[PDB]
Tab-separated table of C-alpha atoms and ligand atoms in Angstrom:
chain	number	residue	atom	x	y	z
A	1	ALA	CA	-0.042	-0.143	0.199
A	2	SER	CA	1.892	2.838	1.354
A	3	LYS	CA	5.508	3.884	1.094
A	4	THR	CA	5.590	2.605	4.710
A	5	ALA	CA	4.076	-1.026	3.942
A	6	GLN	CA	6.326	-1.720	1.116
A	7	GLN	CA	9.395	-0.485	3.043
A	8	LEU	CA	8.692	-2.505	6.250
A	9	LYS	CA	8.205	-5.733	4.066
A	10	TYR	CA	11.478	-5.232	2.238
A	11	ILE	CA	13.307	-4.584	5.487
A	12	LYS	CA	11.963	-7.440	7.037
A	13	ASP	CA	13.033	-9.449	4.014
A	14	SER	CA	16.533	-7.948	4.070
A	15	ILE	CA	17.422	-9.444	7.317
A	16	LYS	CA	19.004	-12.939	6.833
A	17	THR	CA	18.386	-15.804	9.224
A	18	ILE	CA	21.133	-18.084	10.323
A	19	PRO	CA	19.751	-21.632	11.545
A	20	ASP	CA	21.394	-22.965	14.660
A	21	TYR	CA	23.270	-19.833	15.548
A	22	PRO	CA	24.609	-19.386	18.118
A	23	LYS	CA	23.264	-22.949	19.231
A	24	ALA	CA	21.159	-25.714	17.760
A	25	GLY	CA	17.505	-24.589	17.500
A	26	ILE	CA	18.043	-20.742	17.406
A	27	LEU	CA	17.176	-18.889	14.226
A	28	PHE	CA	19.709	-16.074	14.581
A	29	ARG	CA	18.280	-12.691	12.943
A	30	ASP	CA	21.516	-11.224	11.467
A	31	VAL	CA	20.953	-7.325	11.037
A	32	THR	CA	24.559	-6.936	9.427
A	33	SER	CA	22.714	-8.032	5.935
A	34	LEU	CA	20.446	-4.981	6.596
A	35	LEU	CA	23.677	-2.814	6.894
A	36	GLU	CA	24.874	-3.624	3.431
A	37	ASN	CA	21.472	-3.104	1.860
A	38	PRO	CA	21.476	0.340	1.343
A	39	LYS	CA	17.654	0.544	0.583
A	40	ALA	CA	17.058	-1.361	3.245
A	41	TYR	CA	19.348	0.525	5.769
A	42	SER	CA	17.993	4.159	4.400
A	43	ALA	CA	14.335	2.764	4.819
A	44	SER	CA	14.874	1.918	8.257
A	45	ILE	CA	16.178	5.236	9.484
A	46	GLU	CA	13.500	6.733	7.283
A	47	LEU	CA	10.728	4.976	9.117
A	48	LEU	CA	12.251	5.388	12.701
A	49	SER	CA	13.025	9.203	11.941
A	50	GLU	CA	9.409	9.904	10.574
A	51	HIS	CA	7.549	7.694	13.473
A	52	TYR	CA	9.306	10.510	16.005
A	53	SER	CA	9.043	13.472	14.005
A	54	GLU	CA	6.501	15.189	16.631
A	55	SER	CA	7.454	13.643	19.541
A	56	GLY	CA	9.318	16.590	20.862
A	57	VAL	CA	12.605	14.277	21.414
A	58	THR	CA	15.828	16.487	22.310
A	59	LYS	CA	18.428	13.735	22.714
A	60	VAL	CA	18.957	10.119	21.196
A	61	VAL	CA	20.716	7.531	23.225
A	62	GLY	CA	22.123	4.255	21.644
A	63	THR	CA	24.333	1.822	23.462
A	64	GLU	CA	27.615	0.532	21.993
A	65	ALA	CA	27.769	-0.713	19.494
A	66	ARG	CA	24.992	-1.805	17.202
A	67	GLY	CA	22.708	1.017	18.765
A	68	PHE	CA	25.075	3.222	17.446
A	69	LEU	CA	24.104	2.041	13.823
A	70	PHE	CA	20.541	2.877	13.922
A	71	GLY	CA	20.493	5.938	16.865
A	72	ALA	CA	23.200	7.847	15.214
A	73	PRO	CA	21.446	8.227	11.963
A	74	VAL	CA	17.941	8.729	13.677
A	75	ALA	CA	19.639	11.356	15.678
A	76	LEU	CA	20.860	13.035	12.213
A	77	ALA	CA	17.486	12.752	11.037
A	78	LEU	CA	15.887	14.593	13.590
A	79	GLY	CA	18.583	17.246	14.256
A	80	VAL	CA	19.327	16.300	17.933
A	81	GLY	CA	22.209	15.297	19.525
A	82	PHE	CA	23.474	11.527	19.950
A	83	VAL	CA	24.313	10.427	23.402
A	84	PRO	CA	26.355	7.191	23.326
A	85	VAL	CA	26.069	4.679	26.424
A	86	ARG	CA	29.445	2.891	26.380
A	87	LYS	CA	31.157	-0.254	27.994
A	88	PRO	CA	33.022	0.995	31.253
A	89	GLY	CA	36.133	2.695	30.679
A	90	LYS	CA	35.753	4.061	27.118
A	91	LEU	CA	33.941	7.705	27.775
A	92	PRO	CA	36.272	10.161	28.855
A	93	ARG	CA	34.629	12.576	30.820
A	94	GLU	CA	32.555	12.094	34.198
A	95	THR	CA	30.302	9.100	33.931
A	96	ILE	CA	27.647	7.330	36.021
A	97	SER	CA	27.225	3.565	35.615
A	98	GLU	CA	24.726	0.895	35.634
A	99	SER	CA	24.794	-3.083	35.674
A	100	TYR	CA	22.882	-5.357	33.851
A	101	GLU	CA	22.660	-9.209	33.630
A	102	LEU	CA	24.087	-11.390	30.924
A	103	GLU	CA	23.514	-14.868	30.363
A	104	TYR	CA	26.625	-15.835	32.124
A	105	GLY	CA	27.609	-12.857	34.469
A	106	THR	CA	26.895	-9.177	34.840
A	107	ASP	CA	28.472	-6.091	33.002
A	108	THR	CA	27.828	-2.390	33.302
A	109	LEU	CA	26.916	0.531	30.981
A	110	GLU	CA	28.111	4.448	31.402
A	111	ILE	CA	27.167	7.642	30.095
A	112	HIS	CA	28.450	10.947	30.356
A	113	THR	CA	26.960	12.990	33.457
A	114	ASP	CA	27.155	16.292	31.534
A	115	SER	CA	25.197	14.964	28.332
A	116	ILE	CA	21.762	14.511	30.010
A	117	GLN	CA	19.834	16.980	32.009
A	118	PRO	CA	16.575	17.963	33.297
A	119	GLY	CA	14.353	18.752	30.658
A	120	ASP	CA	15.797	16.100	28.203
A	121	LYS	CA	13.342	14.200	26.295
A	122	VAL	CA	15.467	11.162	25.378
A	123	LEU	CA	14.631	8.328	22.715
A	124	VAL	CA	16.559	5.258	22.979
A	125	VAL	CA	17.174	3.277	20.018
A	126	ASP	CA	18.612	-0.195	19.483
A	127	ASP	CA	18.957	-2.638	16.807
A	128	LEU	CA	17.049	-5.738	18.314
A	129	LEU	CA	14.782	-6.404	21.567
A	130	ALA	CA	15.567	-9.455	23.220
A	131	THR	CA	15.456	-9.670	26.955
A	132	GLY	CA	15.759	-5.950	27.232
A	133	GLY	CA	18.573	-5.774	29.906
A	134	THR	CA	20.686	-3.392	28.394
A	135	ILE	CA	17.655	-0.553	27.620
A	136	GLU	CA	16.498	-1.034	31.357
A	137	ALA	CA	20.140	-0.218	32.574
A	138	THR	CA	20.182	2.712	30.110
A	139	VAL	CA	16.734	4.061	31.223
A	140	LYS	CA	18.290	4.135	34.735
A	141	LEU	CA	21.265	6.055	33.605
A	142	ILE	CA	18.965	8.581	31.565
A	143	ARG	CA	16.464	9.313	34.851
A	144	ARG	CA	19.322	9.599	37.212
A	145	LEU	CA	20.473	12.640	35.174
A	146	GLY	CA	17.206	14.217	35.215
A	147	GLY	CA	16.094	12.906	31.654
A	148	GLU	CA	12.555	11.882	30.725
A	149	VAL	CA	12.517	8.654	28.634
A	150	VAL	CA	9.471	6.926	27.444
A	151	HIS	CA	10.123	5.666	24.362
A	152	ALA	CA	12.457	3.204	22.846
A	153	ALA	CA	12.827	2.165	19.312
A	154	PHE	CA	14.158	-1.017	17.627
A	155	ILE	CA	14.513	-2.718	14.125
A	156	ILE	CA	13.954	-6.121	15.251
A	157	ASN	CA	11.577	-7.273	18.557
A	158	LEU	CA	11.632	-11.123	19.788
A	159	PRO	CA	8.635	-10.761	21.685
A	160	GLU	CA	9.154	-14.099	23.268
A	161	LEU	CA	12.232	-13.114	24.890
A	162	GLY	CA	10.020	-10.879	27.410
A	163	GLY	CA	11.913	-7.346	27.037
A	164	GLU	CA	9.075	-5.639	25.250
A	165	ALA	CA	6.694	-6.924	28.423
A	166	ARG	CA	9.094	-5.881	30.864
A	167	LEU	CA	10.207	-2.223	29.354
A	168	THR	CA	6.283	-1.716	28.655
A	169	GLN	CA	5.499	-2.506	32.395
A	170	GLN	CA	7.998	0.072	33.243
A	171	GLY	CA	6.515	3.218	31.207
A	172	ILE	CA	8.435	2.636	28.028
A	173	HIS	CA	6.382	2.392	24.787
A	174	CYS	CA	8.515	0.157	22.519
A	175	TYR	CA	8.344	0.620	18.881
A	176	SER	CA	9.880	-2.070	16.661
A	177	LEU	CA	9.766	-1.965	12.752
A	178	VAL	CA	9.801	-5.818	12.582
A	179	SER	CA	9.262	-8.934	14.965
A	180	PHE	CA	10.030	-12.271	14.663
A	181	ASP	CA	8.928	-15.454	16.573
A	182	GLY	CA	11.520	-17.790	18.500
A	183	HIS	CA	14.182	-17.327	21.102
B	1	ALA	CA	33.715	31.564	2.932
B	2	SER	CA	32.774	28.627	1.134
B	3	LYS	CA	30.104	26.454	3.212
B	4	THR	CA	33.205	24.094	3.324
B	5	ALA	CA	35.632	26.487	5.187
B	6	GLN	CA	33.096	27.644	7.644
B	7	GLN	CA	31.844	24.311	8.735
B	8	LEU	CA	35.506	23.042	9.538
B	9	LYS	CA	36.116	25.800	11.970
B	10	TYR	CA	32.577	24.850	13.454
B	11	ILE	CA	33.433	21.389	13.697
B	12	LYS	CA	37.051	21.985	15.229
B	13	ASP	CA	35.531	24.185	17.790
B	14	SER	CA	32.584	21.654	18.999
B	15	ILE	CA	35.632	19.261	19.920
B	16	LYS	CA	36.176	19.386	23.572
B	17	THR	CA	39.889	19.055	24.900
B	18	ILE	CA	40.202	17.322	28.131
B	19	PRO	CA	43.683	18.017	30.003
B	20	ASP	CA	45.598	15.079	31.418
B	21	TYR	CA	43.495	12.410	30.281
B	22	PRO	CA	43.987	9.459	29.888
B	23	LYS	CA	47.237	10.926	31.761
B	24	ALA	CA	49.663	13.667	32.270
B	25	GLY	CA	50.443	15.674	29.373
B	26	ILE	CA	48.138	14.522	27.127
B	27	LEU	CA	45.264	16.561	25.688
B	28	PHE	CA	42.615	14.534	24.911
B	29	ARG	CA	40.404	15.613	21.934
B	30	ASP	CA	36.501	14.187	22.935
B	31	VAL	CA	34.527	13.557	19.834
B	32	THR	CA	31.626	12.934	22.039
B	33	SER	CA	31.111	16.593	22.241
B	34	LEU	CA	30.670	16.989	18.515
B	35	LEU	CA	28.098	14.005	18.537
B	36	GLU	CA	25.997	15.840	20.804
B	37	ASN	CA	26.379	18.895	18.743
B	38	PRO	CA	23.885	18.361	16.046
B	39	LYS	CA	25.111	21.143	13.444
B	40	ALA	CA	28.731	19.871	13.818
B	41	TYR	CA	27.965	16.546	13.762
B	42	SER	CA	25.660	16.703	10.483
B	43	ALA	CA	28.509	19.014	9.052
B	44	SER	CA	30.798	16.372	9.566
B	45	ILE	CA	29.057	13.604	7.612
B	46	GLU	CA	27.996	16.199	4.984
B	47	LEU	CA	31.688	16.912	4.339
B	48	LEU	CA	33.072	13.394	4.334
B	49	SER	CA	30.208	12.267	1.961
B	50	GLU	CA	30.758	15.139	-0.225
B	51	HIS	CA	34.494	14.714	-0.593
B	52	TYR	CA	33.818	10.937	-1.968
B	53	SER	CA	30.428	11.553	-3.879
B	54	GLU	CA	32.698	10.792	-7.411
B	55	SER	CA	34.806	8.147	-5.823
B	56	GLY	CA	33.124	5.367	-7.120
B	57	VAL	CA	33.098	3.691	-3.738
B	58	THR	CA	30.756	0.770	-3.450
B	59	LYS	CA	31.212	-0.256	0.127
B	60	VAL	CA	32.057	2.010	3.393
B	61	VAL	CA	33.917	0.000	6.202
B	62	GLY	CA	34.140	0.864	9.897
B	63	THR	CA	35.475	-0.426	12.827
B	64	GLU	CA	33.928	-0.616	15.750
B	65	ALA	CA	32.946	1.545	17.894
B	66	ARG	CA	33.292	4.967	17.457
B	67	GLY	CA	33.945	4.132	13.586
B	68	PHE	CA	30.381	3.329	13.235
B	69	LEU	CA	29.399	6.662	14.385
B	70	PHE	CA	31.099	8.304	11.292
B	71	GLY	CA	31.273	5.481	8.719
B	72	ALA	CA	27.646	4.196	8.777
B	73	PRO	CA	26.078	7.870	8.295
B	74	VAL	CA	28.580	8.354	5.455
B	75	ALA	CA	27.281	4.831	3.623
B	76	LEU	CA	23.926	6.263	4.123
B	77	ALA	CA	24.772	9.453	2.443
B	78	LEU	CA	26.446	7.494	-0.650
B	79	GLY	CA	24.009	4.957	-1.009
B	80	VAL	CA	26.076	2.118	-0.272
B	81	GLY	CA	26.292	-0.787	2.147
B	82	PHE	CA	27.905	-0.447	5.201
B	83	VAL	CA	30.509	-3.523	6.417
B	84	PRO	CA	31.485	-3.489	9.982
B	85	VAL	CA	34.654	-4.614	11.408
B	86	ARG	CA	34.217	-5.747	14.661
B	87	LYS	CA	36.378	-7.529	17.897
B	88	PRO	CA	36.012	-11.189	17.874
B	89	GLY	CA	33.226	-13.406	18.108
B	90	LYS	CA	30.379	-10.623	17.458
B	91	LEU	CA	29.649	-11.331	13.921
B	92	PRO	CA	27.889	-14.237	13.108
B	93	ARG	CA	28.586	-15.210	9.538
B	94	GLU	CA	31.963	-16.498	8.351
B	95	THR	CA	34.884	-14.152	9.147
B	96	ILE	CA	38.732	-13.679	8.880
B	97	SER	CA	40.815	-11.724	11.326
B	98	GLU	CA	43.622	-9.433	11.591
B	99	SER	CA	45.914	-8.888	14.953
B	100	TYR	CA	47.218	-5.837	15.566
B	101	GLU	CA	49.340	-4.382	18.617
B	102	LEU	CA	48.254	-2.174	21.068
B	103	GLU	CA	50.443	-0.632	24.017
B	104	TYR	CA	49.949	-3.130	26.434
B	105	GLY	CA	49.201	-6.217	24.127
B	106	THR	CA	47.573	-7.346	21.100
B	107	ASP	CA	43.916	-7.519	19.643
B	108	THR	CA	42.268	-8.577	16.860
B	109	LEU	CA	39.423	-7.170	14.415
B	110	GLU	CA	37.425	-9.472	12.114
B	111	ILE	CA	35.232	-9.091	9.043
B	112	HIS	CA	32.382	-10.920	7.137
B	113	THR	CA	34.196	-13.068	3.936
B	114	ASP	CA	30.800	-12.480	2.222
B	115	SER	CA	30.677	-8.615	2.486
B	116	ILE	CA	33.736	-8.029	0.397
B	117	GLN	CA	34.397	-9.356	-3.057
B	118	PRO	CA	37.020	-8.850	-5.677
B	119	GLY	CA	36.220	-5.411	-7.371
B	120	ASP	CA	34.576	-3.831	-4.515
B	121	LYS	CA	36.030	-0.355	-3.990
B	122	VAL	CA	36.106	0.453	-0.269
B	123	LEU	CA	36.253	3.322	1.879
B	124	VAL	CA	37.369	3.045	5.557
B	125	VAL	CA	35.954	5.826	7.979
B	126	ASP	CA	37.248	6.284	11.683
B	127	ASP	CA	36.770	8.903	14.091
B	128	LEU	CA	40.676	9.802	14.897
B	129	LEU	CA	43.765	9.086	13.247
B	130	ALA	CA	46.669	8.174	15.999
B	131	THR	CA	48.750	5.369	15.185
B	132	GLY	CA	47.008	4.048	12.494
B	133	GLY	CA	47.209	0.329	13.763
B	134	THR	CA	43.444	-0.503	13.712
B	135	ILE	CA	43.443	0.979	10.021
B	136	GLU	CA	46.060	-0.961	8.639
B	137	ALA	CA	44.654	-4.208	10.112
B	138	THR	CA	41.261	-3.025	8.725
B	139	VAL	CA	42.921	-2.471	5.066
B	140	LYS	CA	44.637	-5.938	5.237
B	141	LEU	CA	41.257	-7.491	5.968
B	142	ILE	CA	39.755	-5.714	3.082
B	143	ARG	CA	42.335	-6.746	0.429
B	144	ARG	CA	42.864	-10.476	1.466
B	145	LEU	CA	39.012	-10.499	0.141
B	146	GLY	CA	39.703	-9.083	-3.043
B	147	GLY	CA	38.486	-5.432	-1.996
B	148	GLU	CA	40.137	-2.201	-3.524
B	149	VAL	CA	40.994	0.416	-0.521
B	150	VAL	CA	42.893	3.319	-1.327
B	151	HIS	CA	41.097	5.929	1.084
B	152	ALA	CA	40.436	6.248	4.299
B	153	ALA	CA	38.514	9.306	6.021
B	154	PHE	CA	38.847	10.802	9.755
B	155	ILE	CA	37.294	13.459	11.720
B	156	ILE	CA	40.456	14.238	13.641
B	157	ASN	CA	44.310	13.669	12.536
B	158	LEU	CA	46.953	13.621	15.109
B	159	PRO	CA	50.007	14.173	12.803
B	160	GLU	CA	52.607	14.055	15.611
B	161	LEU	CA	51.544	9.777	15.974
B	162	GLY	CA	52.701	9.110	12.620
B	163	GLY	CA	49.555	7.078	11.291
B	164	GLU	CA	49.335	9.197	7.879
B	165	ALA	CA	52.594	8.386	6.846
B	166	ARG	CA	52.253	4.731	8.180
B	167	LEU	CA	49.158	4.384	6.076
B	168	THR	CA	50.509	6.480	3.228
B	169	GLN	CA	53.303	3.393	2.665
B	170	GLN	CA	50.295	0.855	2.748
B	171	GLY	CA	48.948	3.117	-0.634
B	172	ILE	CA	46.133	4.700	1.273
B	173	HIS	CA	45.359	8.303	1.008
B	174	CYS	CA	43.882	9.833	4.197
B	175	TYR	CA	41.628	12.512	4.369
B	176	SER	CA	40.825	14.276	7.658
B	177	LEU	CA	38.630	17.017	8.653
B	178	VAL	CA	40.572	18.770	11.400
B	179	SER	CA	44.043	18.260	12.892
B	180	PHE	CA	45.332	18.787	16.729
B	181	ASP	CA	48.894	18.819	17.461
B	182	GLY	CA	49.993	16.434	20.633
B	183	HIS	CA	50.253	12.775	21.182
C	201	ADE	N1	17.199	-15.060	17.233
C	201	ADE	C1	17.979	-14.120	17.617
C	201	ADE	N2	18.629	-13.427	16.478
C	201	ADE	C2	19.241	-12.161	16.693
C	201	ADE	N3	19.698	-12.127	18.183
C	201	ADE	C3	19.073	-12.500	19.117
C	201	ADE	N4	19.499	-12.531	20.508
C	201	ADE	C4	18.641	-13.275	21.110
C	201	ADE	N5	17.980	-14.101	20.321
C	201	ADE	C5	18.471	-13.533	18.883
C	202	ADE	N1	44.982	13.272	22.235
C	202	ADE	C1	44.632	12.261	21.889
C	202	ADE	N2	42.699	12.280	21.793
C	202	ADE	C2	42.225	11.527	21.315
C	202	ADE	N3	42.635	10.290	21.236
C	202	ADE	C3	44.139	9.880	21.233
C	202	ADE	N4	44.739	9.000	20.744
C	202	ADE	C4	45.657	9.174	21.145
C	202	ADE	N5	46.303	10.361	21.616
C	202	ADE	C5	45.096	10.836	21.796
C	203	CL	CL1	26.825	-4.527	19.797
C	204	CL	CL1	35.638	3.048	19.793
C	205	NA	NA1	23.645	16.432	33.601
C	206	NA	NA1	34.026	-12.469	-0.200
């Protein structure tokens, strides 16, 4: 139908699936094929930017590193500043930190304290919503700095992994371009 | 005067300097302040993409992570695929690897074998040119797969660290928007 419905279809199709990776039974959805498809990649940025055009967002936050690939072009499209959330020890200015759980341990994300401030309306962008661990931690970073965050946006959602449910149940309206079944 | 010369000034002024980081005597050029200035960030992409508009580039490569922030918007501008180079174990499809020296040991970078083919013309994009080590590695990955690479682009050049000369001997023409003295 619309330019949006054709684009959403082309996007989903451009994302290749890798069977039995990283373990038997998992159908991996590989966003790197979308990155090397210029029509799919430009489309994705376009749709994300358009969806938030009237939202009054003042900053975009993306986590290292695939969050950078989608968050930063949306920031550039919206004409707002981009704020990276990073693995620990990479950011040079004063930071705060939050932990999150991995399958096999815990790790931390940091943000520059000078980069968010009261007033800010912040969109979080990432590639893929799975368990939502890193977004939960990002949300905390932002709120400690007085930022408002009620939107997170993704290229791919895996609803069966529960990220959406748990972010929703925490004030965050998730928007995702495409969604897949499975873990 | 030209749109170009005024933007360069602006971009150079948007980049914060942090004294004695990461240790005494170093003046750190923090590109994160440029990411959060939408005029500067947008101008930086515009200048990089305009410079290669007639280069016939078919692929843009950027190394994780700060790399992504400049290569991927350049890829999007040029309408060509973005190919990431990553630390080991992140990329899901078949890869090759190149090891390079750090101050306190060695690390490696990987690329998807499927993402570069003989006859591709590859532009490498990074934030800051210091010693040139990761770029030389990145170049070797691209050339092992048949790719042509004769251009590398940067926001910041630190000429005192020898990166540009090193790359010039590897047959790479370096373009950098701004330059800073110091190590
Ligand atoms: N199926 C899947 N594809 C890509 N990333 C994932 N992370 C968790 N499950 C995944
Ligand atoms: N002065 C400096 N600023 C930023 N990155 C660097 N890498 C090496 N020297 C640097
Ligand atoms: Cl990542
Ligand atoms: Cl980095
Ligand atoms: Na602040
Ligand atoms: Na190949």
